[PDB]
Amino acid sequence: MTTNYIFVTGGVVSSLGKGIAAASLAAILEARGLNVTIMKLDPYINVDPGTMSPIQHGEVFVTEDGAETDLDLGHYERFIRTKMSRRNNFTTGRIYSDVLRKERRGDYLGATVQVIPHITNAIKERVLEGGEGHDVVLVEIGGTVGDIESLPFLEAIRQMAVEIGREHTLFMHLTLVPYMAASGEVKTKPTQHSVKELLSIGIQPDILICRSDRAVPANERAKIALFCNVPEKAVISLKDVDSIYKIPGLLKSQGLDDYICKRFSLNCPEANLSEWEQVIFEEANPVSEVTIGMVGKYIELPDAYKSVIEALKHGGLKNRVSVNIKLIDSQDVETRGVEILKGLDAILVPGGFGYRGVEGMITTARFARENNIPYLGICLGMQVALIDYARHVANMENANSTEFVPDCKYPVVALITEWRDENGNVETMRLGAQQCQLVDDSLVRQLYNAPTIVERHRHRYEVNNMLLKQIEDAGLRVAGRSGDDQLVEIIEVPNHPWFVACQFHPEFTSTPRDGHPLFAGFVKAASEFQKRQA
Amino acid sequence: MTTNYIFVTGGVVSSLGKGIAAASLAAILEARGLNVTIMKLDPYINVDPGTMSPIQHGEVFVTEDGAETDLDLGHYERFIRTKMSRRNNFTTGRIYSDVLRKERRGDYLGATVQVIPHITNAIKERVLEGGEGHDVVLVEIGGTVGDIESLPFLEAIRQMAVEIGREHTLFMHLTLVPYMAASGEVKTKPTQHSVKELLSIGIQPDILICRSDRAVPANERAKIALFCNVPEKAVISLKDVDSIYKIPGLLKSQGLDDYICKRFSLNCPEANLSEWEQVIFEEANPVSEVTIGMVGKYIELPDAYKSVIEALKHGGLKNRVSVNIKLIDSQDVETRGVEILKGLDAILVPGGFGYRGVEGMITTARFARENNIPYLGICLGMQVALIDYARHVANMENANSTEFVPDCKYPVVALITEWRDENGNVETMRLGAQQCQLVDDSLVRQLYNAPTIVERHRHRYEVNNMLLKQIEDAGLRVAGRSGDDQLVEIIEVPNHPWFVACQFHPEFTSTPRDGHPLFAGFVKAASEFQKRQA
Amino acid sequence: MTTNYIFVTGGVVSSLGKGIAAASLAAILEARGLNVTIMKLDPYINVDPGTMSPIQHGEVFVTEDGAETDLDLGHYERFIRTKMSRRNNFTTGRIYSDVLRKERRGDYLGATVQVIPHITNAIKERVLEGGEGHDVVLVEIGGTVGDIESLPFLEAIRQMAVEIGREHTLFMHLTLVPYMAASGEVKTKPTQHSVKELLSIGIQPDILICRSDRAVPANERAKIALFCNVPEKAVISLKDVDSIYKIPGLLKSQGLDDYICKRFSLNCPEANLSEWEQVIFEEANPVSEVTIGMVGKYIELPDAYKSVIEALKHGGLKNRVSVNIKLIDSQDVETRGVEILKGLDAILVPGGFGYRGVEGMITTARFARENNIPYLGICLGMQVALIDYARHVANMENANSTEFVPDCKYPVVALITEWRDENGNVETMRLGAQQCQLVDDSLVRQLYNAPTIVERHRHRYEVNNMLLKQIEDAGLRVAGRSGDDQLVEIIEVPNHPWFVACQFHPEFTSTPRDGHPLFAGFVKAASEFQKRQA
C-alpha cells in the first residue's frame, strides 16, 4: 500500500472555498471505501491560532487531542470520519520555531540553514508524517498563488512530487470565472494567468476547478483546457450553491473521483453519497421553522460562531425545522434591554472571551429563564447562566468570576486554586475531548442515552465548589460532573421547559448526518415553545 | 509647444470600456481648453476591417476621409470635436504589410528585419505622425496585458517613453475590482497582478482605473496604491453607470484631469462639462416615449448597429423622448409576416450586406409605407424601400439589385456601368463624407436648413436611373441628389406622414450635444404617430 | 508508423550552437536506423534570406530544389544523408505573407485573423507538412527563450504537444553553465531561470543540454535536475570541443539516444558511429599541411564563406592534410598588391556579389595563373578568372561583366539576352541542383569519374558565348558545359599544374564522410606545389 497525494491550491482571488472543495472530495473518496485523510498548511507567522482573536479569523477549532487549529479542520470533521489531530494543521511560524530551535541546539552541525533545503525539509517531513498509513491524502495550501506568503510551501511540494513520482500525486487548482454583466458573459483570462503562475514555479495543474455563480459552458471549459495543457474532462465547473452538503453530488456528477482513481490505478468501489442525499432532502424539505436568538460579541463576523451555527443547523435537520438565527450584541441588551429578546422562540448564548456587555448576557439568561423560553448555554454562556441564577435565585449578590473581578465576594467561577467563599476562605486550561460523568437522572444523560459522554473542552476557570452548594441547593440540577474533581460539566433548570448549559463544546462533534442530542433537544424545544405560544 | 502623451492599457479581463474611458477623458481635456486627440492601436492581423463581418466586431466606423476603421473611432467622435482619420487607427497586419513591402523594396539595405527594431520603429513613427500638432494625445492599446497579441506595441511604447522623456508621458491602466457576493466584498488581487505584469515588460503605471459595478472603498484604493507604487490620489474608482455621458462628470469629480495637467505643467482652465450635464439632465428627464422597430440581420449582436442605435438615442435626447428598439429579424418578417410589425410607432430599416431575409425587409417597407407608419431607411434600407415602392406602386414586378439577381429585368439598383432598363438596354465604391445637393422643396433640405449637405458614405451600387423615371414619376419625391452624376441620395413619400430614406450614413455624424435633424424628425414622427394612434 | 517530434530550444545567451547539437543528434539517430528529418523555424521578418547580405548572416544555403535558406540547413546536410527542401525552413515574415494573402482571398470568411489561432495554425500546418512520413522530426526553434520574437512559435508548439500527445514529443533545451574564474567555479542559476521561463509559457523540459567550456560536475547536474523537475540522467553536459564531428560521440557517451528511443518506445539498434570515428581519426591525424589563400570581400565575418571553409576542410580530411586559410581582402590586393599572395601553396577565390575589390580579385587570378600556383575559383571567382585570362591572354582589353559595366566593350559575362560581341552585335537566376555535361577528356570529368554531374547553382549572369571562341581558342579548356544551351560550367588551364573554375557551388554537396573530388584535388595540388617549391 502506497499513499497517494492530491494538492489543493487556489489563485486569482481568495475566499473560493478551498477547504470546502477538498472536504467534499474527501467525502466522496470515503464514500468509495478509500482511506482518505486531509491536512492544511497555513501561511502565517502566528505559531498557534490561540494568539489571535475570534473576530480576526473566526472560531478556532478544538481537536480531540486539545490542539487549537484552523476552523477548516472542523469542516473536515463534518465530511469525513477520519479524525484530525495536531498533525493535520500547522503554520509558517510553527515551522520557523521548530527549525530555529534545531539550529540553537546544534542539529544542523555548523551548516547554513536555508529555506532551501532546510525549511522545505521541515515541511515535507510533516507532510509525510500526517499522510502515514493512508490511501489518499489531501493537502490544502493556504494563501494565494503568486503571493510570497506561501512560495516555500509550493516549492517543498514541487520537490516532494518529483521524489514520490507523478503516479502518486495530482494537482488540483481552484480559480475564478467571474461574470461580467456589462458584457453579459463570464471571462476566463484570469484563470489562464493563474495557471501560468503555477507553471512558473514548477507546477503543472492536472485538475481545474472553475468557481463561479453559475455553470461554466463546455466551450469555455474547452478554451481553458487548451491554454492550460489540461484534458477537457479534467476541467470541472463549480457554480455557487445554497448548501455545502450538495457539493459531493456535483463533483460526483462530473466524474471527478473516477478520474482520480484512474490516475492512481485504484479499483475504487462506486461512491455511496446517499447519506448526504438524505441530508439534502431533509434540508430542503423541513416541516417547520423556528427563531433562535443568539446573544454575544463577535457577531460582526459570523465565522466566530461558525461551529455553533452549523451545530444549530444540524439540530434543525434532525427536527426538519428551519433555524433562524438573530444576531444580538450583548452590549445592546446591556443598553436597550430585554426588548431585543422579544419575538424569539428560543435563546442561545455561545462561549468566547471578553467582559464587554456580558452583564446584558446575564440579563438575557435571566430573561429566558424567568420567562420559560428554551435556552442553550455553552462555556461562557454557562458561566453567565450560573451568575444569573446564583445572584437572582440563590441571592448571591454580585455573583461573578474572578477572571473579571478577583474580589467578587461571590466568585461563582474561579480557578480551582482560586476557589473561595464570601469570607475569603479558600479551597491552566482544560482542552480536548474529555469524559464526563452524566447524572443518570438528568435529561442530558437520556438525550445521549449513555452513563457518560466524551466531549471537547477549552476553558481556564471552573465552577467554584465553595459556593456551588448554595446554587445547587437553591434549586438547580447538576446534570453531569467531570471525573476526578467532579466538576460541574452541565446543568438543567428543574422547572424550565428546556434550560441546559455546559462546559464542553458539543458544536465540535455535531455533523449533518449524525446530528447531536443537545441541538436536537434545544431546537425541538424551541419549536415546541413556539407552538405553545401560538 | 510639445506634445504630451497618455497611454491606456487594460488587464485582468476585457470588455472594460478602454475606449469609453479614454474618450471621456478626452472630452474633459477638450473642456479644459486643450488640443486633445486620440488614436487606437489594434492587435489584429486583419489589415482592414472591411475583410471582417459586423457580427465579428460590430459596425465598422466610416471616417471623413473614407477610411474604414474600428467602431471606437465613432465613439471618439461622440466625445470630442476633432476629426478622426486613417492616421487614428491601424492594425498589426497593417504594420506587417508595410514593413514587408519595405523589405521587398530594399528599404532595409540587406539588414535583418527584426521585431526590435524595425517593427517597433514602424509603430513609433505612426504614433508620432498622428500626434503631430496636438497638446495631448491619447493612445489606446488594444488587447489584454500579459497576452502576446500586443507585446510589440507595449514595447514600442516603452521605447518612446524613454526617447521622449517621462515629463511628457503617462501610463494609465484599467483593471477590474470584481465583487464577490459569496464573500460579500470586492477583491483587489487581480489588479495587483496586472500591474506586476506591466512592470515585467518595463512599464510602471501612473494612473489606475478601477472598473466595477460599484464604488471602490478608499481603503481598498489605498491598498492598491501601496502594492502598485502609485499615489492614492492617482487611484480612480469607476463604477458601472447607465450612460457613458456621465463618466466625464465622474472623472472630473475625482480630480483626474487636474492631476494630468499638473504632470504636464499645463495651465488648464476649469473644465466646462455643462454641455454633457445638459445632455444628462435631458436624458434622465424625457417627457415622452416611443417604440421603434428595427428590421435587419445582425440583431443578435447590437454592436453591429451600434452607430445607429446611438443615433436614435441622440434624436430622442433632443425630443426628450424614450426610445425602445425592437429587434426584428428580416427572415421572420419573411416567414411569420407583418404581425411582427404590429405595436410599433415607427419603422427602422438600417443598411448592410447580404440577401438573407431582405424580402421580409421589403415586406416591412411595404407595411410601413402602406400603413403610414413613420419610416426611416438607411443605405440598403433605402434600396429595399426603392424595391418595395417600385414593385407595388410603379408595378416593377421583381424589382431588385443586380448584385443578387444578374437579370432582374427590373434592376432598380446596379453599378453605373451596369445601369440598364427592363429590355436590357444599358447606359468602384463610394466612401467618406460627400456633398449632396438637397432639393429646396424637400423636407430634408429644410431639416438641415441648407441647399446642400455633406454626409458619409460606404457603398458600391447605385440607383439605376434608366428605370428611375418609372419610380419617380409614379409618385416619389427625390429629396436630394449627389454631385457630378446627380444620383438619388435621398427620397421622401408625398403622402406619408414621415418617410425618409437615404444613401448616406447620418449615424456617423450625430452627436449627443447636437443630435441630428433626421433622427430628430424620425423620432418625433414616431411620437406624433403614437399620439394619433390613441 | 507514427511520427515522433523533438523540439530544440535554448536560452540564457545566444550562440550556443542549437543547430549543431540537433544535427549531431540526427546523425546518431541516423546511425540507430531511424527515419530522421529536421526543420528550423526562423524568427526573422525577412521573407527570404536573399533579401539580406552575406555580412548580415553569413552564407545563405542553397537547397536542392533551389530554395534559399538558413546556413544551418547546410549544416544538417553535413550530419544526415537526407535532403533538405523548402519545407525544412521558413520565416516569420513568410508566415505573415501567406496568412495575409489568405485573408485577402477571403479564406477566413469574415473572421478575425488572430495570432491565436490563425498564425499558430499556419505554423502547425507547416510543421506537420515537413515531418510527414518521418519517424523522428527534429525542430530547431530559433531566437532566444524569453524574447517576444518567438513566443508565437512556442505557443504553436505547446498546442501541438497537447494535441499530438506526450508519447510522441520531447522538449530539449540548451543552456549556459558559464565558468566564473573569479569564484573558480561554474554557476547554474541562469539555467534554473531559463527553465522557469519555459515553464511560464506552458513548456516543461525533458532534456537539458549544459553548454560550457568544460565538463559540468555530476553534483551540479543533480542540482539542476532538482530545480527543473528533470531526471539526473536527462541532464547532459556539453563542453566545448575543437570539432563538431566529435559531438555525436559525446551525446552517445552520455546515453542520450537510448533515453529518446525509450521515450518513443522504439526498438532502436546500436548506433554505428564508426564512420564519424573514422573522420575524427583522420582529422586528428593529418600527415601534412598546406596554406591556402582566400581572396574576397566578406572575410571580416568567417560565416560568409562557411560552406567553402568546410568544403576545404573535407578535402583536407581525405588527403590527411591540414588546411590553413589566409583571409585576404581583394581591396588590399588592389592597394598593397600581389605581395599579399606570397607564401601561399594555393590560391582560392570564393563566389559572392558586389564589385568592391574585384579588380584585385582579377590581379590575384592572374598571379596564380601566371605563377602556376594551384588555383580554385567558384562562381564569381570563375567570372574573375574568365576576365583575367581573356584580358591578359586573349587580349580582350577591359574584359568585364555587364553587371558592373553597361558597355564593357568585351562583355565576357552577361545575361543570355545581353550576350553580345565587341561590335555591339547580340545573340532569372539559376538555382538548385542542375545537371552538367562534363567533357570526357577533362580533369574534372575524371575527378568525378562520370560523364555528367549534378551540382547546385545561384547566379543570374552567364559566360558570353559571343566572345567565348576568342577566349577558348586563345588556349583555354572548357571542362564542362550545361544543358539546352551548353552554358560554360567548368574551365581548366591547359598548362597550369592545377587551375580550375566553375559556375556551380560544390561546397553545398561536400560532406565530412564523403568529401568531394574537387576539393580533394585542390588541396592535394596545394601539397604537391608546396613540395614542388621545397
Ligand SMILES: Nc1ccn([C@@H]2O[C@H](COP(=O)(O)OP(=O)(O)OP(=O)(O)O)[C@@H](O)[C@H]2O)c(=O)n1
Ligand atoms: N505579492 C504579495 C502581496 C501580498 N501578499 C499577500 O496578499 C494578501 C492580500 O490579499 P488577501 O489575503 O486576499 O486579503 P487582503 O490583504 O485584504 O487583500 P485581497 O483580498 O484583495 O487579496 C495578504 O494575505 C498578503 O499576505 C503576499 O504574500 N505577496
Ligand SMILES: Nc1ccn([C@@H]2O[C@H](COP(=O)(O)OP(=O)(O)OP(=O)(O)O)[C@@H](O)[C@H]2O)c(=O)n1
Ligand atoms: N497568452 C495568450 C493567450 C491568448 N491570447 C489572446 O487571447 C485572446 C482571447 O481572449 P479575449 O480576447 O479576452 O476573448 P476570448 O478569446 O473569447 O477569451 P477571454 O475573453 O476569456 O480572454 C485572443 O485574442 C488571443 O489573441 C494571446 O495573445 N496570448
Ligand SMILES: Nc1ccn([C@@H]2O[C@H](COP(=O)(O)OP(=O)(O)OP(=O)(O)O)[C@@H](O)[C@H]2O)c(=O)n1
Ligand atoms: N525582450 C526582447 C528583447 C529583444 N528581442 C529580440 O532580441 C534579439 C536580439 O538579441 P540577440 O540575438 O541575443 O542579439 P543582440 O540583440 O545583438 O544582443 P544579445 O546577443 O546580447 O542578446 C532581436 O532579434 C530582438 O528582436 C525580443 O524579441 N524581445
Ligand SMILES: Nc1ccn([C@@H]2O[C@H](COP(=O)(O)OP(=O)(O)OP(=O)(O)O)[C@@H](O)[C@H]2O)c(=O)n1
Ligand atoms: N528559486 C529558488 C531556488 C534557489 N534558491 C536559493 O538558491 C541558492 C543556491 O544558489 P547559490 O547561492 O548561487 O549557490 P548554490 O546553491 O551552490 O547554486 P548556484 O551558485 O549555482 O546558484 C540558495 O541559497 C537558495 O536559497 C531560492 O531561494 N529560490
Ligand SMILES: Nc1ncnc2c1ncn2[C@@H]1O[C@H](COP(=O)(O)OP(=O)(O)O)[C@@H](O)[C@H]1O
Ligand atoms: N460553490 C459554493 N457555493 C457558495 N459559496 C461557496 C461555495 N464554495 C465556496 N463557497 C463559500 O466560500 C466561503 C469559504 O470561506 P473561507 O473559509 O474563507 O474559504 P477558504 O477555504 O477558501 O479559505 C463560504 O462563505 C462559502 O459559502
Ligand SMILES: Nc1ncnc2c1ncn2[C@@H]1O[C@H](COP(=O)(O)OP(=O)(O)O)[C@@H](O)[C@H]1O
Ligand atoms: N462604467 C461603465 N458603465 C457600464 N458599462 C460600461 C462603462 N464603461 C464601460 N462600459 C461598457 O463597456 C463596453 C465597451 O465595449 P467594448 O467596445 O468591447 O470595450 P473596449 O473599449 O474595452 O473594447 C460597453 O458595453 C459599455 O457599456
Ligand SMILES: Nc1ncnc2c1ncn2[C@@H]1O[C@H](COP(=O)(O)OP(=O)(O)O)[C@@H](O)[C@H]1O
Ligand atoms: N561544444 C561545442 N564546441 C565548441 N563550440 C561549439 C560547440 N557547440 C556549438 N559550438 C559553436 O557554436 C557556434 C555556432 O554559431 P551559430 O550558428 O551562431 O549558433 P546558433 O546556430 O546557435 O545560432 C560555432 O562557432 C561553434 O563552434
